[PDB]
């Protein structure tokens, strides 16, 4: 029943009770670990409903009082009426902010309840969707000074009158397959980019093409919007010791924003919820621009650091990474856009798990995801042992829209 | 009930049905999981069947499965236990059971070796004079001059449970630690505690930075006894830089054979308290975690320093720098003394090729994922981006508490 982590380093050891009330289950079983995996009706809506009202009039004390009984009715009818029924304003924020306080491979948690909740239920065109997502990179990006934030459309209804953003997030590079056979920009966004060139998209084929949006409203065939430059806040990468490094032409984008997540709050799924906040260093400095199947640029690094790349054991790979990661950091500071170094977003974090564990008995935390793809051992969550499991509210993986989508 | 594993770089698809197969328990359940907590008397009733399934696994492994030979040594080690409550394995199953364990161990990045591995019988020992004895051997073997070879070394099996052989020591080789009364360590702090027990049972301590610890042996579940390591066996490196003329004057050092020496071995239900194995090295258990966890020699400001790197800010990636720089030294120190090392880089290849043949050959490979990827440069290397599966399988290595916390003092 109680559950202990302990912290390696630290000593500091903590008792989890908050798995207790988890639902949905993890891929895991008493006889296997799936921890590495990436992936592992009105009878149905009532409980679902019933048990996230309940967490929300506990929220604010008012559980057993007459306004949670009387809200339990009031949905109870319209379930048995309509087979859905609508959050209210109050609790649509509630949710987002919670699907979020829920997010087990979420390191930047800390800052859950700085969110602002867009509410676009009230949306019926691309063209909206195309609105509300520009006011949403507006308001997200402040000139810089990043503020988290969520946009809302529509929730599923029949499953064939779906709100989905095909982009995978809303600010992306495209990437493109070449007559030599390797690949301009970003090898990731291939098949998104073919899409749009498919759907009409005039591609500048360049090395970083911001993408345009594809957006569906209600169920219908997706529409192509460029997304107004001077709202894509983008940093050019400089190192603050090597005078080279801003030749080998990088940039990136200031505003992380996914946006084929689908949030589901008291058995309500809303598939179209962007939501952005800023970026930790090693997302772009490590993953987007080392991956072997990214940018994959340590070769070229290495190659102008004048490295040893004759031997693995030289550690040269290791030696550009950190400097890559040093440069975009670096960067982002120097244009005064809001960034977080992994040392520092860790240790937020283990402020964060610690605030949890006393204040709400426990936080689902995904070790695999949480440890920062450089540098593992010398960030606190290393040492951290955590509990991984499902609470609802929460953000889950969709279908790609296209293997789905009925043109 | 077939399931795939894909690595997300390369889109390889593997798929398990080896997991089918295991038995033991994992510490998650379908609404939780615990794949990150470091740690999640047996009678007739239940060692005949646990016997079994080994002695299957076994004469399956050399096609013999239903030989005359198979059912002989079933019947054998059947009247064996019903006679005496529990059974001896031949040289040929202990041999297997050791290499199987390695095999088995879903921690282990170094397992492409698990073939290779020497086995040393010593469950003829009696005494811990024997013990260190069979302990000098093992080294000296596996240290070969530098040319580094795996081995384990088996003492007698687990019999009540209160004649325990145990060789206290977590591993063979390892630097004492000496906390002062000012509140600073002298030394490796992951030893004070084994280091006070030394002292207490006699140990005249140096009092260093980097001193040997003497072997503490247990036999038979008697009282321990202290002995020194001959010091011309136990081979060190001084840690030197490439490029870095003052990486030297810091006064780093390390021992060239890992060697753990505090896990249990379970082979057909039978239990070895005792069997301390070894490896060789890889670079960054050194230089990441020995050298750099805030924990234990904790050497990354000293280092950072000496660079001249602007340490006024996390941001400024201080730390990464000065820790890529003292695992370059560690690589380079033993490259140039000869002694058998490989980088994270290479082992992690290797171990992705292990487990696509085991996967093939086998029909799975169970791994760890959190133990597996190393604690630096995490995506750089390919298990990054390897899904894996987890279970547990035997023959198998296993924690067990540590003895002084467990044992009965006679006096
Ligand atoms: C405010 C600063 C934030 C930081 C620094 C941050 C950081 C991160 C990081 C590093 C990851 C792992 C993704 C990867 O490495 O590929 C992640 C995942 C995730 N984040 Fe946060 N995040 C922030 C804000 C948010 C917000 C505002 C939300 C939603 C309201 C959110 C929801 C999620 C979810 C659902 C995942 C898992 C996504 C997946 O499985 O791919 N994050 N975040
Ligand atoms: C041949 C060279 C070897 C290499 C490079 C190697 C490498 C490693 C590494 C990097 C770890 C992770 C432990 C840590 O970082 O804290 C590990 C764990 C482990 N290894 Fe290997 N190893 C080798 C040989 C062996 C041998 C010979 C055995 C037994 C016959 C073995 C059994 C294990 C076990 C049981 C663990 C888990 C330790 C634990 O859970 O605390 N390894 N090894
Ligand atoms: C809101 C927010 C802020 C920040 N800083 N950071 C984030 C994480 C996103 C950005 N950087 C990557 C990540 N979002 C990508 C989600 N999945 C990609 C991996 C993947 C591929 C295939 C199948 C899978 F199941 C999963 C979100
Ligand atoms: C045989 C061999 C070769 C190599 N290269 N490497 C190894 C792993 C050992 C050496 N370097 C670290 C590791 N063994 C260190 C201690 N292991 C137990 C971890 C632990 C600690 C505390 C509580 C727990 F539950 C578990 C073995
Ligand atoms: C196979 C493995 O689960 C996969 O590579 C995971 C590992 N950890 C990760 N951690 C983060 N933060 N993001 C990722 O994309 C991944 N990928
Ligand atoms: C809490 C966490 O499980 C613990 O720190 C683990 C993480 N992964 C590890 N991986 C290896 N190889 N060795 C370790 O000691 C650890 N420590
Ligand atoms: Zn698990």
Same mark, same amino acid.
């Given at each position: 029943?109680?559950?202990?982590?302990?912290?390696?380093?630290?000593?500091?050891?903590?008792?989890?009770?908050?798995?207790?009330?988890?639902?949905?289950?993890?891929?895991?079983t008493?006889?296997?670990?799936?921890?590495?995996?990436?992936?592992?009706?009105?009878?149905?809506?009532?409980p679902?409903?019933?048990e996230?009202?309940?967490?929300?009039?506990?929220?604010?004390?008012? #559980?057993?009082?007459?306004a949670?009984?009387?809200?339990?009715?009031?949905?109870? +009818?319209?379930?048995?009426?309509?087979?859905?029924?609508?959050?209210?304003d109050?609790?649509?924020?509630?949710?987002?902010?919670?699907?979020?306080?829920?997010?087990?491979?979420?390191?930047?948690?800390?800052?859950w309840?700085?969110?602002?909740?867009?509410?676009?239920?009230?949306?019926?065109?691309?063209?909206?969707?195309?609105?509300?997502?520009?006011?949403?990179?507006?308001?997200?990006?402040?000139?810089?000074?990043?503020?988290?934030?969520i946009?809302?459309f529509?929730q599923?209804?029949?499953?064939?009158?779906?709100?989905?953003? *095909?982009n995978?997030?809303?600010?992306?590079?495209?990437?493109? +397959?070449?007559?030599?056979?390797?690949?301009?920009?970003?090898?990731?966004?291939?098949? #998104?980019?073919?899409?749009?060139?498919?759907?009409?998209?005039?591609?500048?084929?360049?090395?970083?093409?911001?993408?345009?949006?594809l %957006?569906?409203?209600?169920?219908?065939?997706?529409?192509?919007?460029?997304?107004?430059?001077?709202?894509?806040?983008?940093?050019?990468?400089?190192?603050?010791?090597?005078?080279?490094?801003?030749?080998?032409?990088?940039?990136?984008?200031?505003?992380?924003?996914?946006?084929?997540?689908?949030?589901?709050?008291?058995?309500?799924?809303?598939?179209?919820?962007?939501?952005?906040?800023?970026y930790?260093?090693?997302?772009?400095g490590?993953?987007?621009?080392?991956?072997?199947?990214?940018?994959?640029?340590?070769?070229?690094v290495?190659?102008?650091?004048?490295?040893?790349?004759?031997?693995?054991?030289?550690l040269?790979?290791?030696?550009?990474?950190?400097?890559?990661?040093?440069?975009?950091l670096?960067? #982002?500071?120097?244009?005064?856009?809001?960034?977080?170094?992994?040392?520092?977003?860790?240790?937020? #974090?283990?402020?964060?798990?610690?605030?949890?564990?006393?204040?709400?008995?426990?936080?689902?935390?995904? *070790?695999?995801?949480?440890?920062?793809?450089?540098?593992?051992?010398?960030?606190?969550?290393?040492?951290?042992?955590? %509990?991984?499991?499902?609470?609802?509210?929460?953000?889950?993986?969709?279908?790609?829209?296209?293997?789905?989508?009925? *043109?």
């Amino acid at each position: 029943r109680f559950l202990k982590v302990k912290n390696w380093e630290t000593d500091v050891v903590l008792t989890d009770t908050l798995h207790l009330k988890s639902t949905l289950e993890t891929g895991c079983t008493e006889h296997i670990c799936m921890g590495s995996i990436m992936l592992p009706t009105k009878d149905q809506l009532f409980p679902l409903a019933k048990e996230f009202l309940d967490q929300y009039y506990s929220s604010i004390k008012r #559980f057993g009082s007459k306004a949670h009984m009387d809200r339990l009715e009031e949905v109870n +009818k319209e379930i048995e009426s309509t087979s859905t029924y609508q959050l209210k304003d109050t609790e649509l924020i509630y949710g987002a902010k919670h699907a979020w306080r829920n997010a087990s491979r979420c390191v930047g948690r800390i800052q859950w309840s700085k969110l602002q909740v867009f509410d676009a239920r009230d949306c019926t065109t691309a063209h909206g969707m195309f609105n509300y997502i520009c006011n949403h990179v507006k308001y997200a990006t402040n000139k810089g000074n990043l503020r988290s934030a969520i946009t809302i459309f529509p929730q599923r209804t029949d499953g064939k009158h779906d709100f989905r953003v *095909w982009n995978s997030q809303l600010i992306r590079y495209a990437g493109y +397959k070449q007559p030599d056979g390797s690949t301009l920009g970003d090898p990731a966004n291939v098949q #998104f980019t073919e899409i749009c060139i498919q759907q009409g998209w005039k591609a500048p084929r360049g090395r970083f093409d911001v993408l345009p949006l594809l %957006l569906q409203a209600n169920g219908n065939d997706p529409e192509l919007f460029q997304i107004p430059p001077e709202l894509v806040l983008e940093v050019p990468i400089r190192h603050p010791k090597f005078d080279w490094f801003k030749d080998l032409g990088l940039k990136w984008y200031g505003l992380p924003a996914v946006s084929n997540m689908l949030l589901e709050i008291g058995g309500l799924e809303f598939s179209a919820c962007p939501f952005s906040g800023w970026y930790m260093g090693t997302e772009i400095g490590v993953r987007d621009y080392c991956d072997n199947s990214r940018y994959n640029i340590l070769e070229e690094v290495a190659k102008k650091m004048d490295l040893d790349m004759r031997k693995t054991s030289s550690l040269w790979k290791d030696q550009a990474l950190v400097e890559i990661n040093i440069a975009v950091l670096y960067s #982002f500071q120097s244009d005064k856009v809001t960034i977080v170094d992994h040392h520092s977003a860790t240790e937020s #974090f283990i402020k964060h798990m610690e605030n949890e564990y006393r204040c709400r008995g426990g936080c689902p935390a995904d *070790w695999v995801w949480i440890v920062p793809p450089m540098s593992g051992s010398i960030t606190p969550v290393f040492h951290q042992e955590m %509990l991984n499991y499902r609470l609802t509210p929460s953000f889950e993986y969709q279908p790609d829209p296209w293997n789905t989508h009925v *043109w």
